TrEMBL record:
The lineage of its organism: Bacteria, Bacillati, Actinomycetota, Actinomycetes, Mycobacteriales. The keyword rRNA-binding does not apply. [4Fe-4S] cluster binds at residues 24, 27, 95, 116. GO terms for biological process: DNA repair. NCBIfam families: UDG_fam4, UDG_fam_dom. Signal peptide: none annotated. Keywords: 4Fe-4S, DNA damage, DNA repair, Hydrolase, Iron, Iron-sulfur, Metal-binding. This is Type-4 uracil-DNA glycosylase. Belongs to the uracil-DNA glycosylase (UDG) superfamily. Type 4 (UDGa) family.
Length: 204
């Protein structure tokens, strides 16, 4: 009776989960958004990556990480030599939350994050990843609690006992943060993202 939970079907099939998410009304965000954006990859993936929400391009492409942030992330994954076939990539909330200016993303509230978390739990349960990479604060707090700071713990192998399957957890920055800033800072941050991805990839 809470959030998206009744919209989630009793199957681990990612195709069926994604179809069902197309119908979710688990919070208000389905109203203005074009469609739900489910994650992508297969259930044998070892590494799950969780961003914050679909962006402008993702909302219309119907897949996660197709915009500039995805291209930067792809460059980081390549530099970490993580095979893109080992990846299931998704977001903490599945409907683009936005405003327009004369589309701009707006932060999902904790309520929206918790409302949508059943989809994320269904994905984690379906994929059974060895490691979950949390890309930025919103994703991290979904799983690690609303007080958690990515800045104080990024690149640490974490395990919290209330997360299904007890996967290793590695929090890092969201790739969108590495698009706007000074070059030396963007280059320094890029190297830290590669580092955090390598930590996650070396689990097991
Ligand atoms: S953001 Fe998540 S909970 Fe809210 S309507 Fe979309 S799929 Fe359902």
């Amino acid at each position: 009776m809470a959030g998206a939970q009744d919209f989630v079907p009793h199957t681990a099939d990612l195709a069926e989960l994604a179809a069902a998410a197309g119908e979710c009304r688990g919070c208000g965000l389905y109203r203005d958004a074009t469609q739900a954006v489910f994650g992508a990859g297969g259930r044998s993936a070892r590494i799950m990556m969780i961003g914050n929400q679909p962006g402008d391009k993702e909302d219309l492409a119907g897949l996660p990480f197709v915009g500039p942030a995805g291209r930067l992330l792809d460059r980081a994954l390549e530099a970490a030599d993580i095979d893109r076939d080992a990846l299931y990539v998704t977001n903490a909330v599945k409907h683009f939350k936005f405003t327009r200016a004369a589309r701009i993303s707006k932060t999902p509230s904790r309520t929206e994050v918790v409302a949508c978390r059943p989809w994320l739990i269904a994905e984690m349960t379906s994929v059974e990843p060895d490691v979950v990479v949390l890309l930025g604060a919103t994703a991290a707090k979904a799983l690690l609690g609303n007080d958690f700071r990515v800045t104080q713990h990024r690149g640490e192998v974490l395990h919290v006992d209330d997360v299904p399957g007890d996967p290793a957890l590695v929090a890092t920055v969201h790739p969108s943060s590495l698009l706007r800033g000074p070059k030396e800072e963007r280059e320094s941050a890029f190297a830290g993202l590669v580092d955090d991805l390598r930590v996650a990839a070396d689990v097991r």
